[PDB]
Structures are given as structure tokens and as C-alpha cells.
Design an enzyme around this catalytic site. Structure first.
Site, PDB file in Angstrom:
ATOM      1  N   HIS A   4     -28.280 -21.409  31.647  1.00  0.00           N
ATOM      2  CA  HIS A   4     -28.896 -22.517  31.117  1.00  0.00           C
ATOM      3  C   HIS A   4     -27.791 -23.609  30.782  1.00  0.00           C
ATOM      4  O   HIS A   4     -27.787 -24.562  31.311  1.00  0.00           O
ATOM      5  CB  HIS A   4     -29.677 -22.187  29.863  1.00  0.00           C
ATOM      6  CG  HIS A   4     -30.182 -23.588  29.046  1.00  0.00           C
ATOM      7  ND1 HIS A   4     -30.824 -24.355  29.782  1.00  0.00           N
ATOM      8  CD2 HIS A   4     -29.895 -24.006  27.927  1.00  0.00           C
ATOM      9  CE1 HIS A   4     -31.221 -25.628  28.838  1.00  0.00           C
ATOM     10  NE2 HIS A   4     -30.665 -25.146  27.502  1.00  0.00           N
ATOM     11  N   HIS A  62     -32.399 -19.035  27.053  1.00  0.00           N
ATOM     12  CA  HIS A  62     -31.142 -19.680  26.299  1.00  0.00           C
ATOM     13  C   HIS A  62     -30.054 -18.761  26.474  1.00  0.00           C
ATOM     14  O   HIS A  62     -29.331 -18.361  25.474  1.00  0.00           O
ATOM     15  CB  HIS A  62     -31.507 -19.832  25.029  1.00  0.00           C
ATOM     16  CG  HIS A  62     -32.493 -20.964  24.722  1.00  0.00           C
ATOM     17  ND1 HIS A  62     -33.721 -20.976  24.531  1.00  0.00           N
ATOM     18  CD2 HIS A  62     -32.281 -22.352  24.890  1.00  0.00           C
ATOM     19  CE1 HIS A  62     -34.435 -22.047  24.247  1.00  0.00           C
ATOM     20  NE2 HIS A  62     -33.413 -22.821  24.561  1.00  0.00           N
ATOM     21  N   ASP A  99     -30.921 -31.221  29.263  1.00  0.00           N
ATOM     22  CA  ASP A  99     -31.351 -30.199  28.624  1.00  0.00           C
ATOM     23  C   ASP A  99     -32.649 -29.729  29.207  1.00  0.00           C
ATOM     24  O   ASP A  99     -33.186 -28.345  29.415  1.00  0.00           O
ATOM     25  CB  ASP A  99     -31.783 -30.219  26.906  1.00  0.00           C
ATOM     26  CG  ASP A  99     -31.329 -28.891  26.231  1.00  0.00           C
ATOM     27  OD1 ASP A  99     -31.094 -27.761  26.740  1.00  0.00           O
ATOM     28  OD2 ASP A  99     -31.463 -28.949  24.904  1.00  0.00           O
ATOM     29  N   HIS A 120     -23.890 -26.239  23.820  1.00  0.00           N
ATOM     30  CA  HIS A 120     -24.956 -26.782  22.750  1.00  0.00           C
ATOM     31  C   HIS A 120     -26.012 -25.669  22.545  1.00  0.00           C
ATOM     32  O   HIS A 120     -26.705 -26.042  21.661  1.00  0.00           O
ATOM     33  CB  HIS A 120     -25.841 -27.801  23.608  1.00  0.00           C
ATOM     34  CG  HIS A 120     -26.732 -27.505  24.516  1.00  0.00           C
ATOM     35  ND1 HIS A 120     -26.581 -26.877  25.717  1.00  0.00           N
ATOM     36  CD2 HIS A 120     -28.061 -27.439  24.501  1.00  0.00           C
ATOM     37  CE1 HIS A 120     -27.424 -26.691  26.404  1.00  0.00           C
ATOM     38  NE2 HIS A 120     -28.494 -26.846  25.765  1.00  0.00           N
ATOM     39  N   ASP A 121     -26.162 -24.458  23.022  1.00  0.00           N
ATOM     40  CA  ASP A 121     -26.849 -23.431  22.601  1.00  0.00           C
ATOM     41  C   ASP A 121     -26.267 -22.092  22.414  1.00  0.00           C
ATOM     42  O   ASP A 121     -26.686 -20.912  22.436  1.00  0.00           O
ATOM     43  CB  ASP A 121     -27.951 -23.284  23.858  1.00  0.00           C
ATOM     44  CG  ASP A 121     -29.215 -24.033  23.780  1.00  0.00           C
ATOM     45  OD1 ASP A 121     -29.414 -24.599  22.744  1.00  0.00           O
ATOM     46  OD2 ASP A 121     -29.702 -24.207  24.681  1.00  0.00           O
TER      47      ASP A 121
HETATM   48  C1  LIG Z   1     -37.001 -24.837  24.008  1.00  0.00           C
HETATM   49  C2  LIG Z   1     -37.364 -26.399  23.590  1.00  0.00           C
HETATM   50  C3  LIG Z   1     -36.840 -27.361  24.701  1.00  0.00           C
HETATM   51  C4  LIG Z   1     -37.450 -28.763  24.206  1.00  0.00           C
HETATM   52  C5  LIG Z   1     -35.251 -27.408  24.796  1.00  0.00           C
HETATM   53  C6  LIG Z   1     -37.778 -26.795  25.865  1.00  0.00           C
HETATM   54  N1  LIG Z   1     -36.815 -26.808  27.126  1.00  0.00           N
HETATM   55  N2  LIG Z   1     -38.102 -26.266  28.196  1.00  0.00           N
HETATM   56  C7  LIG Z   1     -36.953 -25.975  29.197  1.00  0.00           C
HETATM   57  C8  LIG Z   1     -37.466 -27.052  30.144  1.00  0.00           C
HETATM   58  O1  LIG Z   1     -37.072 -26.842  31.394  1.00  0.00           O
HETATM   59  C9  LIG Z   1     -38.984 -26.329  27.444  1.00  0.00           C
HETATM   60  C10 LIG Z   1     -38.742 -26.592  26.275  1.00  0.00           C
HETATM   61  N3  LIG Z   1     -40.031 -26.894  25.324  1.00  0.00           N
HETATM   62  C11 LIG Z   1     -40.991 -26.424  25.219  1.00  0.00           C
HETATM   63  C12 LIG Z   1     -42.145 -27.335  24.801  1.00  0.00           C
HETATM   64  C13 LIG Z   1     -41.716 -28.069  23.433  1.00  0.00           C
HETATM   65  C14 LIG Z   1     -42.656 -28.600  22.895  1.00  0.00           C
HETATM   66  C15 LIG Z   1     -43.870 -28.414  23.004  1.00  0.00           C
HETATM   67  N4  LIG Z   1     -44.847 -29.158  22.237  1.00  0.00           N
HETATM   68  C16 LIG Z   1     -45.273 -28.851  20.802  1.00  0.00           C
HETATM   69  C17 LIG Z   1     -46.158 -29.686  20.264  1.00  0.00           C
HETATM   70  N5  LIG Z   1     -46.716 -30.180  21.239  1.00  0.00           N
HETATM   71  C18 LIG Z   1     -46.003 -29.961  22.382  1.00  0.00           C
HETATM   72  C19 LIG Z   1     -46.307 -30.376  23.930  1.00  0.00           C
HETATM   73  C20 LIG Z   1     -44.256 -27.628  23.962  1.00  0.00           C
HETATM   74  C21 LIG Z   1     -43.432 -27.022  24.860  1.00  0.00           C
HETATM   75  C22 LIG Z   1     -41.431 -25.268  26.219  1.00  0.00           C
HETATM   76  N6  LIG Z   1     -41.456 -25.608  27.755  1.00  0.00           N
HETATM   77  C23 LIG Z   1     -40.397 -25.797  28.303  1.00  0.00           C
HETATM   78  O2  LIG Z   1     -40.361 -25.985  29.701  1.00  0.00           O
HETATM   79 MG   LIG Z   2     -30.885 -25.707  21.940  1.00  0.00          MG
HETATM   80 ZN   LIG Z   3     -30.496 -25.786  25.568  1.00  0.00          ZN
END
Ligand SMILES: CCC(C)(C)c1nn(CCO)c2c1N=C(c1ccc(-n3ccnc3C)cc1)CNC2=O
Ligand SMILES: [Mg+2]
Ligand SMILES: [Zn+2]
Ligand SMILES: CCC(C)(C)c1nn(CCO)c2c1N=C(c1ccc(-n3ccnc3C)cc1)CNC2=O
Ligand SMILES: CCC(C)(C)c1nn(CCO)c2c1N=C(c1ccc(-n3ccnc3C)cc1)CNC2=O
Ligand SMILES: CCC(C)(C)c1nn(CCO)c2c1N=C(c1ccc(-n3ccnc3C)cc1)CNC2=O
Ligand SMILES: [Mg+2]
Ligand SMILES: [Mg+2]
Ligand SMILES: [Mg+2]
Ligand SMILES: [Zn+2]
Ligand SMILES: [Zn+2]
Ligand SMILES: [Zn+2]
Lengths: 340, 335, 327, 336
Positions: C71, C67, C219, C107-108
Site C-alpha cells: 500500500h 494496510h 491514498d 503514512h501507515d
Molecule cells: C481505510 C480508509 C480510507 C479512506 C483510506 C480508505 N481507503 N480505501 C482504499 C481505497 O483504494 C478505502 C477506504 N475507505 C473506505 C470507506 C470510508 C468511508 C466510508 N463511509 C463512511 C460513512 N459513509 C461512507 C461512504 C465508506 C468506506 C473503504 N473502502 C475503500 O476502498
Molecule cells: Mg492511514
Molecule cells: Zn494509507
């Protein structure tokens, strides 16, 4: 604040009942004269004097917590507050001191009556059963199908106090004695619904007619109901000054309810409607139809209770005598007819 | 600061023999003694010893809070001090410990000190109309100024040497924050008006010491009772406060007019008829609050009676706003 | 302000990877994108002001593994790609697209590499200020953005009409709040309904929901590139998550499995994220914009790749050192 | 804490819990207890109740944890029972398309009732309350369903706790409707009630469900609730066997208490007399199979449930003989 109250109740010692007031054990005594701050100790004094603390080996810390919790479980409407519960419990004590209850009832029954007296209006909100039903209250959701809505609530609140850690004054009792105590509290508290009294009235009359039979378990049950009702109405057995003040309190409470009923678009009963209610006539009717017959039954069963019926009778006569003062003769003290 | 430290915490009686009475007017205390008075009150309630509050930290906190007030005509430190003093009065005269937890009463008093921090002498609608940074940050959540006051309080607590709660347990610390947020937000008049029917319901059924919502509602009612407490003194206080309040309102109105907006009648110095406005505020906002307080606490009856008496005073001096004869200078130039 | 074609001939393609651009060139790339979308000329944005705004926003990011500014930059670049390839001016007001892009940049802001529940459990000042309203970090990001706009020399909107100024603020707040994953998950059924009935350009609620979905797709846009990108981002994300779990453990708490480096099984977790969160978003985007089909295809192909390399997280044969000295 | 994550993290997409989560073949008792509150939120979100009823998310999180806290830990009547019953409700919603049969508010009431329907159970039945003269029987004296009246009362106490009123969005009219629906549905969980309405349920199945018939709505809600309550019988052998262990442990504990008190327990509650496989087969044939046959008659898509219950019944018959010891015990000893 409850913490410091508890500390004193537990560590100071139980005041001798005789140090409360010289006339404390007399039917003439008015328990409402006791400062509210002195009342929890006075409950402990009465329990001690009736020997309940030693007979039942009630734990002192537990008893102190229970008494404070019961007090804390009353709200502050004009009539149905802790001082009502205290005065009702005091009358129970008077019956014990003056009427030889041990010739009629089991020890555990007299104990149950006193504890029920303390608990019998727990969490009263200054409104009656009809109002719970009409206002679709939570208590009616729980209990309307069974009836005696408020009385079921008061009982439930008593059990909830007993089930609070550190407050179960009966928890060393045997399973049988515990079950018995809780069943007596159910029956006695439910007995405080005037509808219940009216239902059993002929049965009470029949008992007085035939004569009390100590070996008859139904006689025990009826007598408990009669004593509880006599405690509940016991303000009527004092002097004129008590009955007058209690009328101000109960009608304030009623008319507040009547005002809420109007606010939800319903027509309140005459007796709850401050624009229609004529207090002398309502109180006279109550005394004639409800209170006098109760104390006459009590006198029939306990000759030494005669003075109680006589005080109620005299109070009813006092209502007839002051009724004319509810008519404005001459001008108001104002000297003004603006009120018209 | 040095003078607080030098003197030590003064007994309440050494300040004024009447300091804990409802008749007492805290605005009579010189401003330079008010911080001492805050510490005295907290000592008299035993919150310092009971919560093991570090005394220099408390002094630093109080002074920082005092410093955090601007100087508009009404919404300044003397307002926060007098509000805090009333909270103390309610502690001393009403049996608040019968109804509220100790932490609740402590949070109420601290909230009183902090509740108008950084007030600019304008209301919430003005922030929005003027597109202030405060509106940008808070307008979508509502209670713009009140969110700012609480944020200012958080900033003070997080200033080095000022965190009077930094030794509390995690649960008690969190409890303080939640309480202060709720109580400070409750100072928005719009919030009071929204919850008024729930306050009425509570007075109707009777306060339930075991109902956590009743606790929350009672804290709101007490906070509003403290905020309007200038109405529970004598005539000279209600008169002076009317001067200060309307001065503030009218300056707001002048700004709105300069923005091309039509101010509310009570903020428009060419339209506001003070006696009528003041009487309506007293009869329809303040009196209902003190009537609720009375319904819950018999001993609060004198407060309601005092607001009613002051209201009657305003009705009796109303005619003085009509110019009979000529002005005192004998001149009609004012036309 | 440099033309976009001078940066890279592939600059406006969905195949372009903006993380390939040196960080020292990203502020200029922001200005170039805004110029290419003609926002500077159209809204009469003062250039020195815009330049100062862009540098302050960049400076307002910390340096956690994921973050950070790069990003924000890659998110903002995807917004531009959306503009260029999906012809967004057919669907949203100019002011909305502008707000979307500026929101992407901001946004972050000041992110600490930890989620919302961490702020609350650690009783941070941010939790004290924002926990009762929800979306703790997102309320902070928005507040940081307001603080930047209100720094001397940085208010890029200060010449706007009051109606346009207010619209900008309201859109920035709403779009930044939409970046809370909790928000996306709450509005998902409404996004589905919009996709099924069809986007109505004359419906202001559709404008609002579409802004949310585009923000979310910006995002997560790292998932729409090649393998090297999704692989690298998984590393950065799990570094952040595992450091959070470590802090939680030191607090006497138990992290969620996905933040517990002793429990987390990355390919399982990554595949669940892609299948249940990312793919549904890009599928909706495809429902609304048929030109976005390649984005969904890339996410789906990347998920397949993860399934294909999962076996590498089980040690077969011996470790490279020929030792079992890890047992 | 647990509350903090439940509130401040997103609601997990329901599909991410398990690939088979929405299938009648899914065993919800396979989900760790620590994950069940979030699964509740996931289900409510998927059914769109958070949307349609504008439920404040802090309020819903606190409600869910309060309901979980309201369950004691007897062998069977615990939170994991309430969870599995609620999960089955969700399965019916998804697989039987209940929005084509019941109004939204009815389905909402059904699900919340599933969550709350055994609150504060102590592993003793209605017969026990009466025989032992409990406080519960002291309050609810006029008809039966003592425990069910209490489960409803507990649900009401939760809704009335500061911060837990997930019905705050309803008008006063709809609030009353909701309370009355919950009472009706929780009371329907008394098997005595089901037995009383059984003939009306058969009639409804024979003539067919009419959505314009108010009595049909009432009857369907009862049958659906019963179908949720007994849903452990609709899984595999392993689930019917494990549930048998738990319910019979609970029954026998009650029986031991009754004996000590001087009351003679029902045979099925007397560990010295009860023959589990006969008891269980009788329950399957005379109670469980008829319920799932009714469901199948009303909803063709429910056919697999009846088939599983029937098959599980046949498995009990197959293993019944194992309750008479042939050969030597496991230990090679006759010391017993
Ligand atoms: C950090 C939060 C945001 C969504 C922006 C995010 N970005 N990114 C970067 C994408 O290019 C990810 C993000 N969130 C993730 C994430 C979210 C939810 C859950 N979750 C919970 C219950 N059940 C599940 C499947 C698991 C994994 C983690 N992995 C990622 O790749
Ligand atoms: Mg954010
Ligand atoms: Zn972001
Ligand atoms: C016994 C019932 C409870 C407790 C409310 C009660 N206590 N007390 C206090 C006793 O010391 C009174 C009570 N009830 C009263 C009452 C009732 C009925 C009617 N009524 C109805 C139709 N017709 C009439 C006359 C009128 C008046 C009012 N007066 C009272 O004195
Ligand atoms: C400044 C706001 C708070 C309530 C704190 C406030 N304090 N004080 C000081 C009291 O000691 C006053 C306050 N508010 C006022 C006020 C409020 C409402 C309305 N209003 C609206 C619709 N209807 C009415 C009557 C009118 C006037 C003005 N007068 C005051 O005396
Ligand atoms: C719904 C009723 C409750 C909760 C008690 C219950 N649940 N469950 C779990 C359902 O998945 C069972 C229950 N009751 C049982 C039971 C009842 C009656 C008889 N029985 C004896 C002679 N005749 C009959 C009908 C035998 C056994 C025990 N076995 C069970 O499976
Ligand atoms: Mg009563
Ligand atoms: Mg204020
Ligand atoms: Mg049940
Ligand atoms: Zn009474
Ligand atoms: Zn103020
Ligand atoms: Zn059940």
C-alpha cells in the site's frame, strides 16, 4: 464520606432532641454553637420531635439521604452557607416549640415551612439578585423575567434534590398532598426575597390589625411568609455576640460582591462598597426599617414572641452604643500614622 | 524489591511522629526509605484496601517510577516524592473527601509520583529550541515535557508486573487514565497561567460539589499546590530549593548560549539576580496559588502564611548578594 | 541506483499499476523515483543513509490484508506520478514535494488493520497516548517515522539546515495527519473554496491545503487504475473491515454495518464510497489540474463497473454444486 | 461507545445518507434512530457551522448525544420529532438559500433551537402545567409559554455541562446574542405566540421581506421555526396519518389524567368526545395551511410545501367517513 455519614444517620438511631443541648428549645439558644458535623442529626431530631417522621410516614433511608443532599447543596460563602440554613431551620423549630403554631396553621403547612427553611438558600453563590441581572448570569437568563432570581433557583434546587433517586421524602404522598407540599415550598421560598416581604408588608399589618382568622386562607399564606422571614432574620434575635459575628459575615459577603462589581466596571451600592460602607449606620437602618417591624408584627400576632422583638430592639441599641468605636481616637494601636 | 516485601507496609507513625503535619519536611527522609513511605501513605489513606491493589504490583510500580527519574539538581525523584507527600498532607489536613471523589484523590497522588518522569532539567522552550525528539513528537500540541511525563507513566503501567490498575473495571481504568492525563498536563506552568482566571472565578462563586468543571479545576489547583510545596516549609528548604532550581536553570542557559541563543534573564548566570527573581516568583506565582487554596480551604491558611514569611526572609537577606568590603579570601581576583 | 526506464517503460504513466512490481524490487524503485525527481542530488541526501531509511520504513509495516508495505509503496508511486504528469514543481516548493513523497512512504507505519474508533473502544496503549488529541493511528504513524529517523544511520535529513530540517518535520507531521479521513472530511469545504477561487502559489495556506488533497489522492489511488485493481482492493479492504467487526463482536460491541460480515452488502457500500468520497476528491484534483481529468474518468468508469456486476451478489439459478445446502 | 464512533470516525458526507436526503420529499423519520446523531453532524458540517464557529468535535459529539438524551419517550414529543424538525431546518437552508436572508449566526441559532426546542417534554401541554400546578408553572408564573421556557432552560443546562459548550468560540457579546436568539426561537414554538404574531407575519409577506429590517429578521425566524415544527404535515399521506396517531395518543393520555384529577379536559383531549378527522381538518385549514401559504408568499421555492399540506388536508376529508362505522367491524362482530 457521604456514604459513611449516611450509614451512621440511618443505623445509629435518632438522637433525642434533649441530648443536643439542655437549652435547645429556648429562644436564647444559639444554634450556631452546634458543630457543623452534628447538624444533620440535629435536623432528624427536630423532625422527630415535631412528629413529622411518624405523621407523614417518611422513609428513614430517604430522609437521611435528603438531609445530606440538602447540606451538600450549600456552598461556603461567609454567610449564605449550610450553617445559615441550619440556624434558620432551628428557629422554625423554636416557633413550633414556643408559639403553638398548631392553633394557626395546618400540619402540612408547618411541615412545609421547616423543609423550606432547610432548602431556602440552596446553591447560593454569595451574590444577590441585582448582581445576577448585572453580571448576565445563567440564573438571570433563566429567571430575570419573573424576578426573585436567586429564590427561584433555590426552589428549583430543592425540586432537583427531591427528583434525585432515593431522596424524594414525599413520593408516597397522594397527588393532591404532593402538589400542595410543592406549592407551599414555592410560596415560602419565594417569600424569602426581601422585595416580596416589602410588597406584602401593609397586608401583614392589616392582618395583625383585624386579627388572625384561621378560616381565612389568605391569612394562612401571609402568616407563612411572616414566619419564614422571621426565621431568615432570626440571628438578630440572639445576643450581641451573635449579631456582631453575623454582621462580619454578611458584610464580608457584601463587600466581596462590591469588589466583583468594581472589577466589571460598575459602581456598587454603598452597602456593598468597602470604601463607603459605614456598618453601624447600615445595621441600625436595617434593624429599624426591616427587622424591628417584622418582630413587632410577630409579637402582635403571638404575645409570647415579645422577647424576640425586645432582643432585636436591644441589639439595635447596642449598635448605637459601640458606633463611636468606629472613630479612631488617639493614634492607631500601631502608634503610626503611616496609614494616612 | 526484597526490602519492601520483607518489612511489610509500615504505619505512618513508625516513620516519623510528625509525618502527617504541614511542618514536616519530606526531603529529610533518606532516599532509600522513600518507596516504603509511598506505600505507607497509600495504606494510611486506605487506597490499597479500598481499590484492592495487589501489593507486590504496587511495590514494583513504585520502584519503576522511582527509577524513571534522572538526576538533575531539582527535577529528580526526591522532588516527585516530596510532591506526593504534600498530596498526602492535603488529604490528611484538609477535608478533601468533602470536595473530591476518592478516585480523584487517588489519581492526584499517583499523578504526583509520575508527574516529572524522565525530566532532563530543561524546560519546554528548550526542547523546541534544541529540536529534541520530544519536541518533534509533542511541540505542535504544546506542553512538551508534560506529554512526555504522561507517556512515560503509560509505559510504566504497561510494563509486565507493574499495572496497578489491571483489575479495575473498564470505566474505572478509563477514569484513572483520563484523570492522570489531565492532572499531569496541568503541571505545565503555562497551563496554570492560562486557567488562573477560571480558578479565580471558581473561588469567587464558591466551589460547587456538583459541577464537574469545578472538580477538574480543583484537581489542577491541588496539583500546582503540590508542585510548589517546597515554598510552604521553612527558610532552609526554600533556600536549598533556590540553589537547586537556579543550578538547573543556569545549566540550561549555558546550553542555549552554546547554541547561539539568548537565554531568558532567569536562566542566564551573568544576568540573573536571584533574590529579585525569587521574590517575584513567590509574590506573583506561588502566593496567588496558596491564596486560592486558602479561599477554598480555611485550614490551608497556614500554607499561605508560610509562603509569605519565606518571601519576607528573602527580602531581608537580599542585601547579602551585594559584596560589601572584600570577599572572605581578601581577594579581588574574581574581577 | 537504477534508472526508472530500466524498471518498466510505462513506469511514469497513470496507467501503470505499481502493485504489479515484485515486493522484493520496491525499495530499489523508491530510490529510483527519488533519483528521477533529482532529490538525492538536490538535497545532497547520503545514499547509504537513504537506503537504510527505506529498508527500515518497509520493515515498519505489518502484514494486514490492505494496510501493508505494498500500500505504502503504491501510494508513494502515485506521488511520483503526480510529480511527473502534473508538473508539481509549478505549484509547490521542492521541499514540500519531497516531504509529500517521504510522507507517503511513512503514512501507515505499524498499522494494525483497524481504524481509530477501534483503538479507542479497545483501550489500546495507542488510544491511551493519542485519543485526547484525535487521529490516533495517524499520530502513531508519525511517531513511528520520528523513531526511524532517530535510529542510527537513518536520519536522511541530518545534514539539512535547521530551517529545512524543521520544515521537513512540520510538513511530515501535517501531511501524515491529513491522511485521517476525518481530517479530509473536515477540510473539504476549504478545498472546494481553493478550487473555486483558483490555486494561488503565493498563498501558504493554499500550499497547505493542496498538500492535504494530494496526499488523500495518493491514498485512494488504487481507484484510478483498472477493474482488476479496484476489485482486488475491495477484497482486501473488506477483509480488514470484517475482521475488525469480528473483534468488536467478541468485545460485546456492535460493529458499524460496513464492518459486519453478516450485514454488509459490498456493492452498495463500495458504490457509496466511490460516489461520495473518492469521486469528489478526483473531481477537485481535475478542477485544479486539467491533466488529472483521466484519473476522475477512471474512478467514474470503475464505479460504473461495480454497478454492472452488483447482480452477481444475488444467487440466481442454483449454486455450482446444484445444492441448496446453504439454506 | 456510540460516543466513541461519533467522535473518532469521520463525519459522514451528507449525500451518502440517502440520495434524496436534501429534498422536500424526504421523510427523515425513515432514518433509523441509531443513525440520527451522525446525520445531525453531517448536516452541521454541510451548513459549514463546524468551520465558521470553530466547534471542537468532541464538544459537538457530546452536545448532540446530550440533547438526544434530554428527550423522554412520549408518543410524539420525543427525539425523533426533534430530529425531523432539525432536518426540515436543513432543508430550508438548502432549498430556500437562507444565507441570502439571514445572518449566519441566526441560521445557526435556528438549527440548534430546532434540536433543543422540546427538551424534557412529557406529552402534556401548557394548559396542563397551570391546571396541575407543576413545578414548571411554579417557576414561570407571569406569562405563558411554560413548557417553552423550560425547553430553553434545559438547552441552557446542556450548554453549561462540562464538555458540551458548542458556543465556547463566541465572544461574550455573541454568546449573549446566541442565548437571546435561542430563547426567542424556542418561545416562538408556542402556537399561542404564532397566533399572536400572525398579522405581523401577513404584513411582512405582503410588503416583502427586507433583510435590512431587524423586525423582519425576528418575524422570519419565528415563521421558519413554526414551519419546522409542523413539517410532518408537508410530507405524504402516510406521514400525516402516522403523526396523527402519535399526537392524539398523547392528547388523550393527558385527558385521562385530567379526568382523574377532577379537571375537565378540552374536547380534543377527551377520548370519549374527540372526533379525530374533524379535529385534524380544522388544524390543517386554520393553522397549518396558513403557515405554509405565508412561507410560499415569502419564498416561491416553498410552493410545493403548501401544495402538499393542502393535498393532505383533502385526503383527511376523503377518509373522514371511515370514522363512522359502516358495515360490520373488521371481526364481523357487534360485541362492541
Ligand atoms: C481505510 C480508509 C480510507 C479512506 C483510506 C480508505 N481507503 N480505501 C482504499 C481505497 O483504494 C478505502 C477506504 N475507505 C473506505 C470507506 C470510508 C468511508 C466510508 N463511509 C463512511 C460513512 N459513509 C461512507 C461512504 C465508506 C468506506 C473503504 N473502502 C475503500 O476502498
Ligand atoms: Mg492511514
Ligand atoms: Zn494509507
Ligand atoms: C434580609 C436581607 C438579607 C437576607 C440579605 C440580610 N440578612 N441579614 C442577616 C439578618 O440576621 C442582614 C441582611 N441584609 C442587610 C441589609 C439589607 C439592606 C440594607 N439597606 C439597603 C438600603 N439601605 C439599607 C440599610 C442594609 C443592610 C445586612 N444586614 C443584615 O443583618
Ligand atoms: C520549574 C517550574 C516550576 C513552576 C515547577 C517551579 N518550581 N519551583 C520550585 C518551587 O518550590 C520554582 C519554579 N519556577 C520558577 C519560576 C516560574 C515562573 C517565573 N516567572 C515567569 C514569569 N514571571 C515569573 C515570576 C519565575 C520563576 C523558579 N523558581 C522556583 O522556585
Ligand atoms: C403545534 C401544535 C401541536 C404540537 C399541539 C400539534 N402538532 N401537531 C403535529 C404537526 O405536524 C399537531 C398538533 N396539534 C393538533 C391540533 C391543534 C388544534 C386543533 N383544533 C381543534 C379545533 N381547532 C383547532 C385549531 C386540532 C388539532 C393535532 N394535530 C397535529 O397535527
Ligand atoms: Mg435567600
Ligand atoms: Mg514538571
Ligand atoms: Mg413544543
Ligand atoms: Zn436565608
Ligand atoms: Zn514537578
Ligand atoms: Zn416541537
Amino acid at each position: 464520606a457521604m456514604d459513611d455519614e449516611y450509614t451512621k444517620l440511618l443505623h445509629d438511631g435518632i438522637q433525642p432532641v434533649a441530648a443536643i443541648d439542655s437549652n435547645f428549645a429556648s429562644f436564647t439558644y444559639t444554634p450556631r454553637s452546634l458543630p457543623e458535623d452534628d447538624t444533620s442529626m440535629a435536623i432528624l431530631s427536630m423532625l422527630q420531635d415535631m412528629n413529622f417522621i411518624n405523621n407523614y410516614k417518611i422513609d428513614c433511608p430517604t430522609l437521611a439521604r435528603f438531609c445530606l443532599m440538602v447540606k451538600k447543596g450549600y456552598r461556603d460563602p461567609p454567610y449564605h452557607n449550610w450553617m445559615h440554613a441550619f440556624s434558620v431551620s432551628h428557629f422554625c423549630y423554636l416557633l413550633y416549640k414556643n408559639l403553638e403554631l398548631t392553633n394557626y396553621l395546618e400540619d402540612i403547612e408547618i411541615f412545609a415551612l421547616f423543609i423550606s427553611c432547610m432548602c431556602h438558600d440552596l446553591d447560593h453563590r454569595g451574590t444577590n439578585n441585582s448582581f445576577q441581572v448585572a453580571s448576565k448570569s445563567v440564573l438571570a437568563a433563566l429567571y430575570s423575567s419573573e424576578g426573585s432570581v436567586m429564590e427561584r433557583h433555590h426552589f428549583a434546587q430543592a425540586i432537583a434534590i427531591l427528583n434525585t433517586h432515593g431522596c424524594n421524602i414525599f413520593d408516597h404522598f397522594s397527588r393532591k398532598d404532593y402538589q400542595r407540599m410543592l406549592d407551599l415550598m414555592r410560596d415560602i421560598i419565594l417569600a424569602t426575597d426581601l422585595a416580596h416581604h416589602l410588597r406584602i408588608f401593609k397586608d401583614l399589618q392589616k392582618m395583625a390589625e383585624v386579627g388572625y382568622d384561621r378560616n381565612n386562607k389568605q391569612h394562612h399564606r401571609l402568616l407563612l411568609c411572616l414566619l419564614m422571614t422571621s426565621c431568615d432574620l432570626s440571628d438578630q434575635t440572639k445576643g450581641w455576640k451573635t449579631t456582631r459575628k453575623i454582621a462580619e459575615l454578611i458584610y464580608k459577603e457584601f463587600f466581596s460582591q462590591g469588589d466583583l462589581e468594581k472589577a466589571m466596571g460598575n459602581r456598587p451600592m454603598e452597602m456593598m462598597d468597602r470604601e463607603k460602607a459605614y456598618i453601624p449606620e447600615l445595621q441600625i437602618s436595617f434593624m429599624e426599617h426591616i427587622a424591628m417591624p417584622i418582630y413587632k408584627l410577630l409579637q402582635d400576632l403571638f404575645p409570647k414572641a415579645a422577647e424576640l422583638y425586645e432582643r432585636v430592639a436591644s441589639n439595635r441599641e447596642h449598635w448605637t452604643k459601640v458606633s463611636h468605636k468606629f472613630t479612631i481616637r488617639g493614634l492607631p494601636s500601631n502608634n503610626s500614622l503611616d496609614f494616612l
